[PDB]
Amino acid sequence: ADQLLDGLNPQQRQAVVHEGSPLLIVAGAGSGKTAVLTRRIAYLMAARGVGVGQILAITFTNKAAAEMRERVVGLVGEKARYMWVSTFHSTCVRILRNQAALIEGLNSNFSIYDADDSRRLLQMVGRDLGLDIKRYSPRLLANAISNLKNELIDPHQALAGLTEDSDDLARAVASVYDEYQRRLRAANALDFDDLIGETVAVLQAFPQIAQYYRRRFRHVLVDEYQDTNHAQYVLVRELVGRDSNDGIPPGELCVVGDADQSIYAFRGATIRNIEDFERDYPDTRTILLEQNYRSTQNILSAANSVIARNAGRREKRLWTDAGAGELIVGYVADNEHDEARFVAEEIDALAEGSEITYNDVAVFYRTNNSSRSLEEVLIRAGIPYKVVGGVRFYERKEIRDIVAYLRVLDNPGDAVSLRRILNTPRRGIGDRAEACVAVYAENTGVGFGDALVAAAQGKVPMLNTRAEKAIAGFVEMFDELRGRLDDDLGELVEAVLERTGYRRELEASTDPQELARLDNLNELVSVAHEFSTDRENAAALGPDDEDVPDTGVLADFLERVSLVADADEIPEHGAGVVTLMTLHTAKGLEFPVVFVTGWEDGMFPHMRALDNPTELSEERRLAYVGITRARQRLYVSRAIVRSSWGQPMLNPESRFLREIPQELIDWRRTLVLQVGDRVTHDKYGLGRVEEVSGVGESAMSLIDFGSSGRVKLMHNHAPVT
Amino acid sequence: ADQLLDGLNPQQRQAVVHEGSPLLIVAGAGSGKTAVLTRRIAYLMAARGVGVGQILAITFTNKAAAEMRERVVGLVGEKARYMWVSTFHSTCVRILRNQAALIEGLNSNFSIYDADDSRRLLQMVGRDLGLDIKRYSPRLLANAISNLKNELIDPHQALAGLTEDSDDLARAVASVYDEYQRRLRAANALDFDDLIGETVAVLQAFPQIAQYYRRRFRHVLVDEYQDTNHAQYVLVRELVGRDSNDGIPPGELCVVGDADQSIYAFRGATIRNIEDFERDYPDTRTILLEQNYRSTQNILSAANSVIARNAGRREKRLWTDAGAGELIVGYVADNEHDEARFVAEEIDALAEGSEITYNDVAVFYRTNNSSRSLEEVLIRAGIPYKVVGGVRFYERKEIRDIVAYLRVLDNPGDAVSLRRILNTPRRGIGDRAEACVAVYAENTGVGFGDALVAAAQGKVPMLNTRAEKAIAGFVEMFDELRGRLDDDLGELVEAVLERTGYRRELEASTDPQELARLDNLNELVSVAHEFSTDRENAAALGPDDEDVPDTGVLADFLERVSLVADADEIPEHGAGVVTLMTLHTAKGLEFPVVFVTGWEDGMFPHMRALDNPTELSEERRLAYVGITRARQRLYVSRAIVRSSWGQPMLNPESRFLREIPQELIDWRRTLVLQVGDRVTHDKYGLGRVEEVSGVGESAMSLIDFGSSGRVKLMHNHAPVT
């Protein structure tokens, strides 16, 4: 035992004790679902005495499985030798290896392939059939293959649908899927994704192995049921089907999860999986967890109100016995820089109370592109910062490629930078560096390694016609960029993008990672333009021709970028450090004080979600899971104007501000025209801001025009650029 | 409180409760040191109420640290966020990175270097100074650098020792050490080993950082103290020293371990570290754990007897309250194959009792080369087997290189095999540094797979003179080797080894890995000779072939090796699979029934240990840790004769047999001359064995000579080849 029971609310007590028929439970926002799961496991071991080699608890991530097994051992004892707690892929590969030689055509010594090996195989497929660089990018093909496999589509029936849709791209992807599957089976190995589908197919087709495994299993559990797509759901249903002994011994399948925290639909997860769980299993019982002890009442009520606006959702009201807690102090800034300044100021003010260190404060943003400005202020005020699930803004690979292109554009003498960006966009015809083409410097240090003009003329005789034409095009593009050096450097970056074809490839890939890369690079363009403007107005005034040749030459810009990059001496979490991350990786963590940035429509609800209802609901659930990360203090920030593509866009407040309980007016309390900043107006000329006063859109800015005097103006109605 | 105490013998009770002054405890063989450690930690937290952010527990491997953290979480709570339980390297690197901005020249942006980058850098250094292809192999240099650094040797004072020893090699290694260290610091990076020394140096040199960290830490825990070399011991002593306020704030130290299980001296661990622990800490107390619950009394007594003969050892007698258990089966075989047959037969017989499966039986061998025969019989009787800490015999890289050499010698048109062996047996100046030469010949030319011969005459003009000189010698020596196909297979393999320089460079490196590789190569030669005998003369003569052979080529050997290369088709630990491993990786595991192979002097007491007393004592401790792995059955096997390096050697019984008292070993049980095997005698001619009777030295073999009749003879006194 009763010690496991007399410490919990009766809801989880009844969830633990109940054993007849399959069970379902809704895990509320931080309602200790892991604790309830392990306590139920201990009660199962102590009362029903389940076989240690028969009980199966499965998860999706290694950390959760490790924590579950550790807590079970600390609660009931060390029996992990026969007790199994693993993830889907680990359990699947272990079970398949147990019977890996009983399948004809599939070697029991099969290996695994990463993305590079699959890319090589698919490029061989394409060069056998077509061309994998125009409209047939390897990443798009791989993603399509994985998504089609995730729905249990056999290669033999895959070619039966190409004529049904009557789409050329559909026919091409079906044919390449069939070829890839057959030549991968000819390669006596598989990838990291098709193993689940192949295991399901083998268990369905071979009856004796299915009967043996059904005899081998009696209990099956599962966690975070939302992420389970169709394929793993089918696997679990087949591995828990009660047709072996007709249920003479009970088959315990209880599922923990909550349909309202499903944010991983980008990997193919289906929200229908749990919402129609009752339809698949008519003999199930459901129970809700409406109580949690992690957050305060105000934040909990706000999250519950914001999540209830979806149309099709199971009713669930959260509550807690703790205090009301502090309010939700929203903020409105002049721009992203003003917002970063505000959040840095608030972090510093709250840290100077000796109650919580920097390690107790977390900041969330929707996308990586909205992470530069914050870092800047966080590197200016001196407060240490660390980012999880990624790298610094200047440390990402796309901005690295762009700055390397700029470095090459500065002087031709660079070698590492030029060698890194030779084949960064594959481009097919236009540049090529595989098959030891990149190593062609004649293996002799004739001057410095460039070739190029030597490569175009034919210094290296091993280079075929295609490669020499590609290198000639590359050097002609380089010469054109050299000759274009006449305008502002932001337009220079845009010209680089349009010449190199990076932007078109990024937009046509149509992947969340590639979309993030595109937005990040566009933000880099905006940063370059902002630096150019700041140097041109505040510092140049009369720019003429200084020691720095032009207004926005790459010398000073690259020097600034490098010196900011060479500043990683900031201490890590050894001392009090602040944490940064994106919303998609915020699941499973806990923090007492949280800030959220970019809380306006258009940005937080992306244009990809403004139309499709599924994406709208998914991002609303994402906002819910972001909100419920706080414990006692949660702050929201929005920016009236933000720069993108080198232009200032206007974005209203998000529709999520009204969904939150209005309560007292809290969003206006506690591009940009800061002290010393110079801006331009089409009718008034140039002006320098003197004083910054007010909070939110109520702020009126005083600008001295020099000869034309001082004028006080607004920010949204005055056409200031 | 008292619950942690009223379940244990009073020895560990007193070890747990005792808290004043530093404490030392001797952890007996399987005395549950981890459980006692975690219970003491829980009692420390509950009674003394030590601060969570001040208590430090350290380990050396991730698995043990994870287990200890699991026990802590399941026993005291989830305060793991403020207490660090990690390895030496991880904790040290985190500590140095937290304060990484307070050291000039060293910045936190440094990237750790694997063996590849260090190898490249030192190769460039050698090119600058000497030549790394002869007498200056990168592996030997890296090992020497790591070993010299492990003893806290400053690079500046390293120049002062080169003139003292007056050795050219010593001066060279000191100079390259200094050059490598300064060039690496110019590269703002460090290797995986110098981090400990750098942390020690920084903590010693900078007083304020040392004072801050001394104020930060209050408790320090360590496990498996034997592996602690001099450098990490100095680090621990400095991090626990009371020099912050000149002894005002005391330190807490409790050290677990056992000087009699120290087998990792090959990595530089010092047995003097624990045996002289009292000298450095005169105010400590020691306590022994003479009781364990894992093994039976007979095996425990055998281990106690065998470990007692070391002259310098703390007195420790193991005992247990369990039953006497079974005896010890000491088997003597005719040769290696006979021993493998015996162990397979015993495994099968013991498995057919439904008491234990194949997962409860483990077999140990001193070196990898003593596994081949075993695998063979384990693939013949059908019992599945898996290997921990390595791969199958035919899956290792050295035998892979030699079999690839053989395959290329068979088919001159092979491509993958020829491309793998060009540079992997590092020759460089010998054969070639780079890899892609076919692309020089018009990508592939007119199917020019064998472009090497065209490159020898120098048809490709873009290659340097040194590379073509190296390639010409390679192709000429390969052609010369191809013209000697009129000998036996074993002599052919030995000729390949001596011509390719594999043997000399593998021998001269003087490291355990390369010694294992050399022994592996000799075992491969023995296998080739055995197959040649079985296919050419033995069981291959008579009216069927007479004196004229059947055009016996190496293709038969190649196809046999390829066919038996399917040993990875065996299932992994998901089924009833037996385990194979070497002695050095047997620490920390547990198994019910164990077998040990190769229990003769010259093999188990290695040739490197017959002279040096330190190696002799170390291998005796290795025998102790191997013996104490059993739980209820431990069987020892030895072979009177064995083939090594292509020749049959005679090795007596090891001195460890007489070490165990000759009343607890159930002696005997129920190159070789097996049924159907043909052998040769210089005086009697050829003979075919009919009946195999007896075991070991009591066995007498009956051989029919055909025309000369049947004769019964012995094995050790009849010169049979």
Side-chain angles (χ1 to χ4, degrees), chain A residues 1-670 672-721, chain B residues 1-670 672-721:
Chain A
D2 295 331
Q3 310 177 55
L4 302 172
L5 312 179
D6 52 1
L8 319 171
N9 224 27
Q11 293 73 9
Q12 51 275 44
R13 295 182 179 179
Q14 293 294 335
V16 161
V17 179
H18 187 76
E19 77 283 38
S21 72
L23 175 63
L24 189 63
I25 159 188
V26 170
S31 289
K33 67 171 192 59
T34 300
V36 179
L37 193 62
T38 176
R39 291 173 184 271
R40 185 181 177 273
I41 290 301
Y43 186 88
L44 168 68
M45 264 300 182
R48 291 173 52 189
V50 64
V52 58
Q54 295 285 345
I55 170 72
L56 260 293
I58 204 177
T59 57
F60 207 88
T61 168
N62 309 325
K63 184 178 182 179
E67 171 58 36
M68 168 56 58
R69 63 156 65 258
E70 291 192 9
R71 196 166 300 267
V72 163
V73 168
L75 261 296
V76 77
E78 173 64 34
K79 269 77 62 174
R81 290 84 48 178
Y82 300 88
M83 204 279 298
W84 280 346
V85 167
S86 300
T87 173
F88 271 84
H89 66 81
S90 295
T91 299
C92 176
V93 299
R94 170 189 64 193
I95 295 308
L96 185 136
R97 288 290 188 176
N98 175 81
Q99 203 89 196
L102 274 307
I103 292 88
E104 194 278 338
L106 182 141
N107 59 326
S108 33
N109 62 279
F110 76 105
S111 63
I112 219 64
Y113 290 116
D114 199 4
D116 51 2
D117 304 329
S118 180
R119 198 275 177 277
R120 296 276 74 92
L121 295 179
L122 78 87
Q123 75 85 13
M124 237 291 283
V125 167
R127 76 183 192 179
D128 295 355
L129 290 185
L131 218 175
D132 305 333
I133 218 50
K134 45 183 188 60
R135 298 174 59 259
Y136 298 132
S137 62
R139 305 300 84 187
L140 172 58
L141 268 62
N143 180 27
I145 297 322
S146 302
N147 178 274
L148 189 57
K149 194 275 318 179
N150 203 20
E151 307 294 336
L152 287 177
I153 303 305
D154 194 78
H156 92 282
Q157 59 185 169
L159 46 87
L162 53 90
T163 179
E164 305 172 352
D165 197 70
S166 302
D167 166 69
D168 53 354
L169 184 60
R171 304 175 189 269
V173 300
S175 297
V176 72
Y177 167 77
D178 187 77
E179 171 69 29
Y180 176 85
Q181 287 283 172
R182 60 207 194 104
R183 215 176 66 189
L184 190 70
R185 300 312 308 118
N188 61 86
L190 293 175
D191 76 327
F192 197 73
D193 193 15
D194 303 9
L195 55 98
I196 297 291
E198 293 302 316
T199 302
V200 171
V202 169
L203 266 299
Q204 292 281 48
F206 289 76
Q208 72 290 341
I209 306 175
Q211 175 67 208
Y212 160 72
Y213 278 144
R214 275 298 303 109
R215 185 69 68 259
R216 201 54 52 186
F217 285 96
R218 299 292 87 172
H219 291 49
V220 168
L221 253 61
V222 75
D223 189 4
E224 61 269 354
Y225 209 56
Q226 309 84 197
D227 63 9
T228 65
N229 52 62
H230 204 63
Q232 36 223 26
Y233 158 76
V234 168
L235 189 146
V236 173
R237 195 265 182 266
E238 185 175 356
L239 265 292
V240 83
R242 209 52 210 79
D243 301 331
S244 65
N245 299 121
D246 304 333
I248 299 178
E252 192 71 22
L253 180 96
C254 75
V255 177
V256 294
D258 48 338
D260 293 320
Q261 290 183 9
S262 61
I263 64 185
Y264 280 82
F266 81 114
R267 280 187 171 180
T270 305
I271 186 54
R272 187 224 61 89
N273 216 132
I274 301 184
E275 293 193 3
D276 286 339
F277 178 84
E278 304 180 351
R279 306 304 97 87
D280 290 329
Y281 302 160
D283 40 348
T284 183
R285 204 271 295 268
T286 175
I287 177 61
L288 297 82
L289 267 56
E290 298 89 330
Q291 186 182 10
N292 67 331
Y293 324 104
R294 299 304 173 274
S295 172
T296 50
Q297 180 60 45
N298 291 318
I299 308 175
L300 198 69
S301 302
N304 190 16
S305 66
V306 74
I307 198 51
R309 296 301 298 266
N310 272 328
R313 173 224 171 183
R314 191 184 315 274
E315 178 68 21
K316 177 174 56 180
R317 155 85 59 173
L318 300 90
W319 65 270
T320 186
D321 50 355
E326 299 82 351
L327 265 299
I328 305 305
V329 181
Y331 187 81
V332 175
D334 199 352
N335 81 324
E336 77 294 340
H337 267 178
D338 189 13
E339 192 275 342
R341 174 203 58 87
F342 157 78
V343 66
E345 180 69 21
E346 276 296 332
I347 285 183
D348 179 68
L350 297 178
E352 201 64 25
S354 178
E355 313 95 354
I356 46 189
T357 69
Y358 299 107
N359 299 339
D360 278 331
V361 181
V363 182
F364 295 161
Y365 37 78
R366 178 59 173 87
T367 325
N368 301 89
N369 69 330
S370 179
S371 178
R372 186 232 40 176
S373 65
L374 195 156
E375 292 179 28
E376 301 289 340
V377 80
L378 260 292
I379 213 180
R380 188 183 310 274
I383 288 84
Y385 80 111
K386 69 148 185 172
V387 54
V388 71
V391 290
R392 314 294 192 89
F393 164 73
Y394 290 88
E395 201 72 293
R396 284 184 270 268
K397 64 183 307 302
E398 308 77 17
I399 176 178
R400 195 81 58 81
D401 301 329
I402 289 305
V403 301
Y405 257 101
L406 297 169
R407 194 93 59 85
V408 171
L409 185 56
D410 181 21
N411 44 21
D414 199 326
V416 43
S417 172
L418 185 55
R419 209 66 68 194
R420 187 174 181 272
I421 68 169
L422 172 60
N423 195 7
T424 296
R426 189 66 67 89
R427 189 162 50 181
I429 44 183
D431 62 76
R432 200 171 70 96
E434 49 273 25
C436 272
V437 169
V439 312
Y440 276 148
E442 213 232 10
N443 201 25
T444 304
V446 178
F448 73 98
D450 72 336
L452 305 191
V453 45
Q457 73 92 3
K459 159 174 167 291
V460 276
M462 306 68 58
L463 213 55
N464 55 43
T465 300
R466 299 185 65 260
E468 68 199 7
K469 188 260 300 184
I471 298 308
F474 171 83
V475 66
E476 290 295 341
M477 175 192 63
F478 162 67
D479 177 69
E480 158 64 28
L481 202 62
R482 275 271 189 277
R484 202 223 58 85
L485 183 59
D486 303 81
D487 200 3
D488 182 17
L489 78 99
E491 195 68 22
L492 176 139
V493 177
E494 250 185 10
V496 169
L497 297 180
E498 62 89 6
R499 288 302 302 180
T500 192
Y502 216 95
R503 169 161 278 175
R504 291 94 59 86
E505 164 190 351
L506 271 270
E507 290 185 347
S509 180
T510 71
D511 297 322
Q513 293 75 11
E514 212 64 27
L515 264 305
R517 297 152 61 105
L518 163 68
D519 290 329
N520 182 16
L521 213 151
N522 187 74
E523 201 276 345
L524 168 66
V525 178
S526 175
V527 177
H529 173 274
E530 211 290 327
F531 171 85
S532 62
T533 300
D534 279 1
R535 190 267 191 266
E536 167 65 23
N537 287 17
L541 200 161
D544 56 71
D545 197 324
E546 209 191 354
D547 182 70
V548 162
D550 63 77
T551 73
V553 83
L554 301 87
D556 41 328
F557 172 86
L558 269 62
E559 195 82 352
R560 173 208 170 188
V561 173
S562 56
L563 66 86
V564 172
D566 302 325
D568 205 9
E569 49 84 22
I570 296 304
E572 77 285 4
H573 67 274
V577 81
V578 77
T579 63
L580 270 70
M581 70 189 69
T582 177
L583 268 309
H584 290 165
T585 185
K587 186 175 184 59
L589 300 177
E590 288 284 349
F591 291 112
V593 177
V594 78
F595 290 73
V596 198
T597 304
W599 204 289
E600 72 281 1
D601 76 320
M603 172 54 57
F604 189 79
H606 276 265
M607 297 62 60
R608 292 95 197 189
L610 255 54
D611 305 331
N612 310 129
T614 302
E615 304 294 336
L616 169 62
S617 57
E618 183 267 359
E619 281 196 337
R620 190 181 299 263
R621 298 192 307 272
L622 183 62
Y624 163 83
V625 75
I627 281 285
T628 185
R629 281 293 162 274
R631 298 208 63 179
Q632 65 267 37
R633 284 195 179 89
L634 170 143
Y635 292 158
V636 187
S637 64
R638 58 181 294 269
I640 47 187
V641 295
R642 50 180 53 247
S643 52
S644 191
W645 309 73
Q647 322 300 140
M649 68 162 53
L650 264 295
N651 301 326
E653 68 176 2
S654 86
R655 59 194 63 178
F656 297 153
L657 280 327
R658 312 177 190 93
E659 306 283 44
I660 241 66
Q662 181 52 231
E663 308 172 352
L664 282 310
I665 168 177
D666 55 355
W667 53 278
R668 199 107 147 194
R669 59 180 188 177
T670 304
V672 59
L673 282 76
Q674 283 170 327
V675 184
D677 305 20
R678 299 183 187 173
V679 285
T680 58
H681 188 264
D682 318 337
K683 188 180 178 180
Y684 291 151
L686 80 168
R688 188 173 182 179
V689 196
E690 292 188 357
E691 181 183 358
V692 194
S693 62
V695 179
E697 307 182 356
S698 59
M700 300 178 178
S701 50
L702 169 64
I703 330 169
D704 184 12
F705 302 157
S707 58
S708 301
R710 300 179 181 180
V711 173
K712 194 176 193 180
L713 291 178
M714 33 189 168
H715 310 155
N716 304 338
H717 299 81
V720 188
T721 303
Chain B
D2 299 329
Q3 310 179 27
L4 299 175
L5 309 181
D6 53 0
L8 312 178
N9 196 267
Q11 282 63 282
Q12 51 275 47
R13 294 183 176 181
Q14 291 291 340
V16 162
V17 177
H18 186 81
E19 81 298 329
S21 73
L23 175 63
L24 180 63
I25 160 189
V26 170
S31 289
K33 68 170 189 60
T34 301
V36 179
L37 186 64
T38 179
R39 278 194 260 267
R40 183 180 180 276
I41 296 310
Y43 181 87
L44 156 74
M45 182 63 68
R48 292 174 55 188
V50 65
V52 51
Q54 305 293 274
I55 171 180
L56 258 288
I58 223 66
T59 332
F60 207 88
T61 171
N62 304 274
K63 187 176 183 180
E67 175 68 32
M68 176 55 59
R69 186 192 53 79
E70 164 185 49
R71 303 307 301 271
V72 166
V73 171
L75 263 297
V76 80
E78 202 248 350
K79 283 81 62 179
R81 41 192 166 276
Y82 286 149
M83 48 104 66
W84 300 268
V85 184
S86 303
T87 60
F88 280 81
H89 57 88
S90 298
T91 303
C92 169
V93 70
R94 175 192 56 84
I95 287 302
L96 74 89
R97 187 175 293 273
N98 183 26
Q99 205 77 200
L102 281 310
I103 290 88
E104 305 180 5
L106 180 143
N107 187 9
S108 65
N109 55 7
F110 78 103
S111 177
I112 200 67
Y113 279 171
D114 200 337
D116 50 1
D117 193 277
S118 178
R119 184 179 177 183
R120 147 73 174 78
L121 187 57
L122 82 91
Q123 186 68 213
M124 188 257 293
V125 173
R127 293 188 296 250
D128 299 353
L129 291 185
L131 222 179
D132 306 317
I133 218 58
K134 50 180 189 58
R135 290 174 58 258
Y136 300 128
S137 61
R139 304 299 83 190
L140 170 59
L141 269 63
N143 199 332
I145 297 324
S146 301
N147 178 275
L148 185 56
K149 196 275 318 179
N150 199 23
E151 306 294 337
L152 284 177
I153 301 306
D154 193 297
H156 307 76
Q157 61 185 350
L159 293 80
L162 55 91
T163 178
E164 303 169 347
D165 199 68
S166 302
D167 166 68
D168 53 355
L169 183 59
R171 301 174 186 267
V173 299
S175 298
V176 303
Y177 167 71
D178 193 76
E179 214 292 329
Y180 163 87
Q181 181 59 38
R182 62 197 185 100
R183 189 167 299 182
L184 194 68
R185 296 311 306 118
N188 57 89
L190 293 174
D191 82 321
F192 198 75
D193 197 11
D194 297 6
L195 53 95
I196 296 291
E198 283 290 333
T199 304
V200 171
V202 169
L203 266 297
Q204 293 281 36
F206 292 166
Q208 62 282 352
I209 307 179
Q211 175 73 207
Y212 159 67
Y213 275 95
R214 281 298 301 108
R215 203 60 54 186
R216 184 186 179 91
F217 294 100
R218 287 301 100 198
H219 282 208
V220 172
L221 263 295
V222 296
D223 193 355
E224 65 269 350
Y225 209 54
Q226 305 80 212
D227 61 12
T228 68
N229 56 68
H230 201 64
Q232 33 200 14
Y233 157 77
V234 169
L235 186 145
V236 172
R237 196 264 181 265
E238 184 175 356
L239 265 290
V240 83
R242 283 66 46 196
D243 301 330
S244 61
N245 205 341
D246 199 2
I248 291 188
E252 179 73 14
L253 261 189
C254 3
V255 177
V256 306
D258 40 359
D260 293 321
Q261 293 187 7
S262 61
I263 63 185
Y264 279 81
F266 81 114
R267 280 187 171 180
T270 306
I271 186 54
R272 186 225 62 88
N273 216 130
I274 303 183
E275 293 194 5
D276 286 337
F277 177 84
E278 304 180 352
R279 305 304 97 90
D280 296 327
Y281 297 83
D283 41 317
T284 189
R285 194 186 73 176
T286 173
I287 177 60
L288 303 86
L289 268 57
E290 299 89 331
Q291 186 180 6
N292 50 15
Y293 315 128
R294 301 304 176 274
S295 172
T296 51
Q297 181 58 249
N298 294 324
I299 310 173
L300 198 61
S301 301
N304 206 121
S305 63
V306 68
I307 201 51
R309 198 158 299 268
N310 272 325
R313 173 219 169 187
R314 191 184 317 274
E315 177 69 20
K316 177 176 57 180
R317 158 82 69 169
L318 298 89
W319 67 272
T320 184
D321 51 355
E326 305 87 322
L327 273 303
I328 303 304
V329 170
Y331 186 85
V332 183
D334 197 358
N335 83 328
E336 189 184 23
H337 273 180
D338 189 14
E339 192 275 343
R341 174 203 57 88
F342 157 76
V343 63
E345 179 69 20
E346 272 295 333
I347 285 183
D348 178 68
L350 298 178
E352 201 65 25
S354 179
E355 312 97 353
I356 46 188
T357 69
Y358 301 108
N359 302 342
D360 283 334
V361 180
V363 179
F364 296 161
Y365 36 76
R366 177 58 173 87
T367 327
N368 304 89
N369 66 336
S370 177
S371 63
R372 191 275 307 185
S373 69
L374 191 148
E375 306 187 17
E376 301 289 340
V377 75
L378 264 303
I379 213 181
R380 189 181 309 275
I383 287 82
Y385 80 115
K386 73 182 185 71
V387 176
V388 178
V391 290
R392 280 81 171 178
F393 168 75
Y394 290 89
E395 282 287 350
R396 303 193 180 96
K397 63 184 308 302
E398 310 78 11
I399 175 182
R400 197 80 60 82
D401 301 337
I402 281 304
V403 74
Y405 260 139
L406 294 170
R407 187 175 299 176
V408 172
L409 194 142
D410 172 58
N411 299 328
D414 197 336
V416 177
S417 180
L418 185 52
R419 208 67 68 194
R420 183 178 180 271
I421 64 187
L422 177 61
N423 194 22
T424 308
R426 169 59 67 99
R427 304 305 115 87
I429 308 98
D431 302 355
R432 170 168 159 88
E434 215 166 5
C436 46
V437 70
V439 292
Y440 307 155
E442 274 62 28
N443 193 25
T444 177
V446 188
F448 299 149
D450 62 351
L452 309 180
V453 60
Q457 301 98 34
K459 74 102 176 184
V460 277
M462 78 303 296
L463 203 56
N464 64 79
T465 306
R466 305 184 69 262
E468 68 200 4
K469 158 188 169 298
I471 294 298
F474 160 83
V475 62
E476 241 102 29
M477 67 87 64
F478 207 100
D479 176 75
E480 178 270 350
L481 175 59
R482 191 177 298 181
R484 198 198 45 81
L485 276 175
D486 40 356
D487 197 352
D488 195 12
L489 269 303
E491 197 69 21
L492 183 139
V493 180
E494 191 175 6
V496 171
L497 281 179
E498 61 91 2
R499 287 308 304 266
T500 194
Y502 218 106
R503 156 163 291 165
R504 293 91 57 85
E505 79 103 344
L506 256 291
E507 174 268 354
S509 300
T510 321
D511 301 313
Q513 296 75 10
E514 1 278 37
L515 263 303
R517 297 163 68 169
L518 173 59
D519 294 330
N520 216 322
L521 256 299
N522 277 5
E523 207 281 338
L524 179 61
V525 151
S526 175
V527 177
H529 174 80
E530 172 64 25
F531 171 79
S532 58
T533 299
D534 283 337
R535 196 232 62 86
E536 172 71 25
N537 297 282
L541 297 183
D544 51 355
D545 299 328
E546 309 107 7
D547 57 350
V548 178
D550 201 6
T551 323
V553 299
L554 52 98
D556 324 330
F557 178 86
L558 265 296
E559 59 84 18
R560 171 179 177 264
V561 170
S562 63
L563 176 57
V564 304
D566 300 331
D568 50 359
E569 301 182 5
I570 297 306
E572 65 182 2
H573 53 255
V577 50
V578 81
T579 56
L580 278 313
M581 67 187 68
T582 175
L583 267 309
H584 289 166
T585 186
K587 187 174 185 59
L589 297 176
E590 192 78 17
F591 290 112
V593 178
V594 311
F595 289 72
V596 197
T597 304
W599 207 285
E600 310 92 344
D601 69 320
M603 278 310 178
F604 186 86
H606 223 47
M607 312 258 69
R608 293 90 189 84
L610 258 56
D611 304 330
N612 309 128
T614 302
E615 304 294 336
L616 169 62
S617 57
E618 184 267 0
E619 282 198 335
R620 190 178 299 262
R621 297 192 306 271
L622 185 60
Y624 165 83
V625 73
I627 286 289
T628 185
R629 280 295 164 275
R631 294 214 61 180
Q632 64 268 50
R633 285 194 182 86
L634 169 141
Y635 295 0
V636 185
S637 64
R638 60 178 293 269
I640 48 184
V641 307
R642 53 175 54 248
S643 176
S644 182
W645 197 1
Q647 307 301 140
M649 69 163 54
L650 268 300
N651 302 326
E653 69 174 1
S654 80
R655 60 195 63 180
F656 299 153
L657 282 327
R658 302 180 306 271
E659 193 66 27
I660 310 182
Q662 302 291 347
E663 72 275 6
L664 207 51
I665 310 135
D666 188 8
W667 203 238
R668 296 187 185 272
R669 177 55 62 89
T670 330
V672 68
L673 281 75
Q674 287 173 324
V675 184
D677 307 16
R678 290 206 211 171
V679 287
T680 59
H681 189 264
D682 318 336
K683 184 181 177 179
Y684 291 150
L686 80 169
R688 186 174 183 178
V689 197
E690 292 189 359
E691 181 182 1
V692 191
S693 62
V695 152
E697 297 187 352
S698 59
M700 300 182 181
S701 51
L702 168 64
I703 340 170
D704 183 15
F705 302 157
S707 58
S708 301
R710 300 179 180 181
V711 173
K712 192 176 191 180
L713 293 178
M714 32 192 168
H715 312 153
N716 304 339
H717 298 82
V720 186
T721 303

